Amino acid sequence: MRVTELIIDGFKSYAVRTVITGWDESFNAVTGLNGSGKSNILDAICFVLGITNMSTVRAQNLQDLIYKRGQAGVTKASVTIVFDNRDKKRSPIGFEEYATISVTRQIVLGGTTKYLINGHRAQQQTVQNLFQSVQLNINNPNFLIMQGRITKVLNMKPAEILAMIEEAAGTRMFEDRKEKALKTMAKKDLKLQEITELLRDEIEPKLEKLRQSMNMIDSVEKKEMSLKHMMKTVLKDKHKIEETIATLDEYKRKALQETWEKVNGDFGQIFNELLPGSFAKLEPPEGKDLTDGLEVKVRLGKVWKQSLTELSGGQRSLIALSLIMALLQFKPAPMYILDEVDAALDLSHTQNIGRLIKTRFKGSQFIVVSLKDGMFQNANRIFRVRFSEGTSVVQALTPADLK
C-alpha cells in the first residue's frame, strides 16, 4: 500500500473539499509558509488512521475538528485516504481484490464519527485490523517520527539504548521455548524435593529405628535404593534441560550481537551520509560490558568527541535521526512520516535527508512535513500550502516545475 490521494473536506483549516492527488511512491514533502495548512494535512492523515497519541486530533467533542466547529455553514467533516494496492505482496489481508483502497472518516454535529472502506460503511475495528495487517500499528505507531522522539533518543541512558537493540533483536519471540523449558525443569525440581521429603520424613527415620524385624530392614532399604536410582536419573534428565536452556541463552546473545552489529553499521553509515565526513557508533560507555548498555559516540569530522553535549543543535538532531532511521528496518512499515524535524537543520542537511530517502529507503513511501519553508526542495513531489480565504489551498509541484 502507498498513499496516492488525500481528500480533506470541512476539516480544521480546510473549509472546502480539497483533493490532494499525485502522491509520490517514494518521497513527498509538505511545505510552504501556511503553518496550519501544513500541519492539518498530517492531522487529517492521523485522523483517518485512528492515531490516539496525537493531541492535535484529540478532543472531548470531535465537532471541534470540523471547520469553524460547525458554525460557519459546514456542519460535517470528511477525510479520505486513497491507497494504491497493486503490489499484492503488500496488500492488507482480505482486501487483495481491490486495485485501490479508500478509507474515509467522517465527523457530524455532536462529534460522532463513522468509517467507510471503498465507499461502504465499515466498523472501526475493521479499519484498524486493515492498517495493522500492513504494519501500520495504530496501537504503538512505528512509522511517525516527531521532534519528541529525537529529543527522547538524545536523552536515553545506556541501558535504554541497549533496550532498543534488544527489542530489535526479536528474541522475546525466541523466549517462548525458554519458559517452556523452565517449567519442565521446575517439575523435575519438584520430584527431587519430594524424593528428599520421603527420605527425610519416612525412609531414613524408619531405617534408623529398624536397625537399633530383620526382613523389614531390607524391605525399606530396597526402597531407599529405588528412589536413589530415581533421584540420579531425574538429575540427569534435569541436566539435559539445563543444556537446552544454555543453548537458547546462547542463541539470544548471538542474535543480539548480530543486531548490535547491523544497527551500529547502518547507524554510522546513515550519519556519515547526513553529515558528510562525520561518523558515529554505539559502544558500551567506558570499561563496561554490553549488557550494561550502549551509548552514542560521535566523531565530528575526523575527531572523536567525549560527549554529545559538544555537538550543535543540528548535529544532535541528525545523530538521533540517524539512529531512529537505522532502527526502522526492524519494525518496518510501508510509509514513514517525518514531522517537523528540521528546526535546527541547514538546507544542505535536509537535502542530505532527501538523498538518504531516495537511495536507502526504496520500497517505502516517505512523507516529510517541513517546519520551515524552502527545505526538502529535492523531494519527488512537493505539496506547497499557503493561507487564503478562511481555507487552506495546496499546490502540487515537482523540483522540475517552472511554477
Residue numbers in the entry: 1 to 212, 989 to 1179
Task: Give the published text.
Each head domain (hd) can be subdivided into a “RecA”-like lobe that contains the ATP-binding pocket and a “helical” lobe that merges into the coiled coils; they connect the heads to a half-doughnut-shaped “hinge” dimerization domain. Smc2hd and Smc4hd are furthermore connected by their binding to opposite ends of the Brn1Cnd2/NCAPH kleisin subunit (Onn et al., 2007).
This transition is presumably the consequence of a pronounced reorientation of the Smc2 helical lobe and coiled coil by ∼25° upon head dimerization, which is transmitted via D-loop and adjacent helices to create a P loop conformation that is compatible with nucleotide binding.
